[PDB]
């Protein structure tokens, strides 16, 4: 299986209550290893996972320096955008940013990301060729012209391919016990009656990592995607993930339905009959 | 490993 | 443009009376990030409750996990109360061993 590393940063202005709050986190695949909160008294990058605190003070002081430089950059970006768009200073505004790289079962580069959003909408993003920028609006293309002239796309590509990947390959090593495990789901089925004329069949998947999974329902092999409720994939809190799918079926016909589960950790897809 | 630009650059 | 949270309350492990567990409330798909979440015991707030660090998905929507340790009882009821800019009143979602 391939792998990914991401850092997600959020900056929320709070007018009248002081300077914007900046939160940044980071992930290897679906596991978060770090945190920075601009309101925390620590003012340091912090370990969120048992395999990253084996790093030495050379790591944490250097990480801390870069994320706080990012923090003041995004804090100033909020005012530039506020002026770009002529928006009121009484409104709260949000700047989101994410970057990172993907690597394969080999360990070498696949793709990388450098991108920003403003009030939940795309602003400027590095194209997947990593040589050019997509820009949503007119204001973002000012930033595009400023960024193309200053050659930042060339420096970020150097980071994404060079530094991001080697740190990724290192974390996958420091933590290979937890990170490269794939736990298959524990799948079962529960039966909830409603009326005499109808009842609900629910198909569960529990304790699986990574989060990518597919649950589907079939009627006699006809794949019934109508009247099937399927919830978003929720974390269990111990590092694993959960999910379930359900169908309302007329009793007594529950025998004709089959749940279908596919996950990286399964040798072959599971099918379940009530 | 977090990103670092030699000179930080804004919007 | 805003978005309403999608709320899920549930237990870390399947529920058995008397064994300790964790009680989760997962909110997702909302925007902006300001949100209030309480876990309720028979209508009253549980006051040692921890939340995951703020992150977001590919569509920029935010997700958070509020969780705490509890030991369930047949008589005890638990619920999750959430408030957001998109909700004209707070939203209470009851816990169910089967959902």
Residue numbers in the entry:
A (entry chain A): 1 to 274
B (entry chain E): 1 to 11
C (entry chain B): 21 to 119
Give the article text.
In this study, more than half (54.5%) of the subjects had the HLA-A*2402 allele, and M1 protein-derived peptide H1-P25 (M1 99–109; LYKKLKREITF in pH1N1) with HLA-A*2402 restriction is 1 of the 11 peptides. P25 is conserved between H1N1 and H5N1 (named peptide H1-P25) but has a dominant mutation with substitutions at position 9 from Ile to Met (I9M) (named peptide H7-P25) in H7N9 and H9N2 and Ile to Val (I9V) in H6N1.
To characterize the binding of peptide H1-P25 derived from pH1N1 (or H5N1) and H7/H9 variant H7-P25 to HLA-A*2402, in vitro renaturing and circular dichroism assays of the HLA-A*2402/peptide complexes were performed. The overall conformations of main chains were similar in the two structures. Another structural variation is contributed by Lys4. Although this residue is conserved between the P25 peptides of pH1N1 and H7N9, the salt bridge formed between Lys4 and Glu8 in HLA-A*2402/H1-P25 is not present in the structure of HLA-A*2402/H7-P25. This indicated that variable antigenicities of nonconserved peptides could be largely influenced by both exposed positions for TCR docking and anchoring positions for MHC binding, which should be investigated in the HLA-A*2402 cohort. In particular, a cluster of conserved T-cell epitopes shared by H5N1 and H1N1 may be related to cross-protection against H5N1.
